[PDB]
Every structure is written in C-alpha cells, then in structure tokens.
Structure 1
Amino acid sequence: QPIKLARVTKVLGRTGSQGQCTQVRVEFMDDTSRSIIRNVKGPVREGDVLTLLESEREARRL
C-alpha cells in the first residue's frame, strides 16, 4: 500500500463542529486526471502539496 501526495486546486470552505478543518479538493501530480475532496487540518494555501497516508476515502461536501 503506497502513499500518495497531491496538490490542492481550490479552498471550498471551513467545516467542522468548531470551524477547525477545511475542505479542499486535491489533484494528484502522479495522475492529472483524478481529483477528490478531502478535509485538511491547519492553514492551507492554494497549490501546496498534501501528504495523503491513504487516498481512497472521499470527504462529503458541506
């Protein structure tokens, strides 16, 4: 089970019961065709790289 890394395409909004986690959609540089939505904890810019321990589950939109 390898580990994937991807770049965010845009910031969708601030979610969580207390507004501490952000939903963004990530775009793999390994494959320029597949994009998914993920929650991310912490301040996130546009274009940075997220280290995905596992890249199989998709975060529901808010």
Structure 2
Amino acid sequence: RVQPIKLARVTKVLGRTGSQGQCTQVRVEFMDDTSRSIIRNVKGPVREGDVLTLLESEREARRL
C-alpha cells in the first residue's frame, strides 16, 4: 500500500447534502495528475481555488 501526499485543487463543490455531516462532494484536479480523477468528499468550508490537504491520493467518495 502506498500513500501519495497530494494538494487537491477543488474544481467545483456540489452542495452540502446527502450525508448530514456538513460534508461536500468535490471533483478536484490535483494540479499534477492528468488521467487520475478521484472524486471525493469533504466536511465544511470549501471554496474553489484552495487545495485540500491529502495524505493519500486514494480516497474516492461516491459512498464507497
């Protein structure tokens, strides 16, 4: 198992719904990878432009 650290620039957020943890679905583009697109989830204040912090480049959130 590998844990690539990454800086996920959120290209859009998708509403604060679905799960009641004030989560938020995101479609980051890591500034770095081209054909890897991990669609993820966060919790709380997220605007487009600032990279979310990542220990592991592999947390794909679609209820998985």
**Range of TM-score over shorter length:** 0.7 to 0.9
Query: For residue 56 of structure 1, what is the aligned residue in structure 2?
Result: 58
Which structure shows the bigger proportion of residues in strand conformation? 1
Aligned residue pairs, count: 62
Q: Which consecutive segments of 4 or more residues in structure 1 shift more than 3 A?
A: none
- 1:7, 1:29 within 8 Å by CA — same for their partners in 2? yes
Question: Could you say if the C-alpha distance between residues 17 and 61 of structure 1 is closer, same or farther in structure 2, counting changes exceeding 3 Å?
Answer: closer
Partner of 1:39: 41
Q: Give the structure-1-normalised TM-score.
A: 0.75
Shift of residue 36, structure 1, vs aligned partner: 1.9
Q: CA RMSD in A?
A: 2.4
**Matches of 1:2 and 1:61, distance apart in 2:** 22
> Would the aligned equivalents of 1:39 and 1:59 in 2 still touch at CA under 8 Å?
yes
- Does the 8 Å contact 1:23/1:61 carry over to 2? no
Give me the identity figure in percent.
100
For the Cα contact (< 8 Å) 2:10–2:48, is it kept in 1?
yes
Task: Answer with 42-51 or 32-41: which moved more.
Answer: 32-41
